[PDB]
Amino acid sequence: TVSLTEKYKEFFKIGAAVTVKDFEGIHGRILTKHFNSLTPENDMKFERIHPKEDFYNFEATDKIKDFALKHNMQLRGHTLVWHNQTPEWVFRDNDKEAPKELVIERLREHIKTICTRYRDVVYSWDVVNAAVEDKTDVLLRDSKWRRIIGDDYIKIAFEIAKKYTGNGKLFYNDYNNEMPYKLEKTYKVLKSLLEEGTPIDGVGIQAHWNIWDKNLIDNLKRAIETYASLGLEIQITELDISVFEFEDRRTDLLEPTEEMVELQAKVYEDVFRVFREYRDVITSVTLWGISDRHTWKDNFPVIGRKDWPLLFDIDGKPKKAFFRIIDF
């Protein structure tokens, strides 16, 4: 039995990425059993919730909020400002590109609207997502947000959100931010935000991981400690552990191999022991899905294959990895 949220009740919240259909059937039972935190996988993203300037779509996010309230769960607000899944209208002023202040004013109104509607159920917001340049050694990714608003756009987004979020915690969220090159760069960016009076409460470590990273444990321990030194909360926001190396695009596997299944268990053990070790600084751990039945990893980075990245298998049964992380 041993629901995960209960077992971890004194350590951190235990979360899952969700859509409306996940409240039904076997997924719905896993959630209410094991999880006390929910993140809308897509429905709170700008393109989905606010597809045209004069049109918001609240149906899905309202349903997610309601389900959470009815089951004593809370939400992570994902995400306000991101270079992906953001509609082009935001950056257009008719036939011209939109200037800095117009984009800021649209952002103001978007954040006001979304944060006002969900502030009562959201405990943490991903205010800015994946703003740190992941490839080159320039600090900031060069998105339309970053280009048009300018160098201060992260502070600007955080100051706006702080108006409407109450006691919700404000997070900067990103991937690969446990890796040495990106850790150093992210640390720099966050340290400077804080010295500028940015109301940032913590860092999201997305944790889109895989079984073959022999550097992960050392990388994770470092990162957690490095971010903690800035006085930031830590949340593991989108945990999954792929059986493939990122650039292994093989499409042949119908199932995980024995070495893969067992290596995954060890890595889940290793990461969750690290999560448990840093219980004082980690406030939430969310997995990017419930079971291997629905995972974005089936279409990223390769359209139309299968991955087995989560704690519950395609049938909905707890994997040996599950029982490892609850043996404590």
Ligand SMILES: O[C@@H]1[C@@H](O)[C@H](O[C@@H]2CO[C@@H](O[C@@H]3CO[C@@H](O)[C@H](O)[C@H]3O)[C@H](O)[C@H]2O)OC[C@H]1O
């Ligand atoms: O065709 C579109 C799909 O590609 C899209 O898939 C979603 C893409 O976002 C995924 O979540 C992100 C993973 O990366 C992190 O850095 C971000 O923080 C996450 O938001 C999500 O899991 C996929 O479903 O869905 C919409 C389609 O139109």
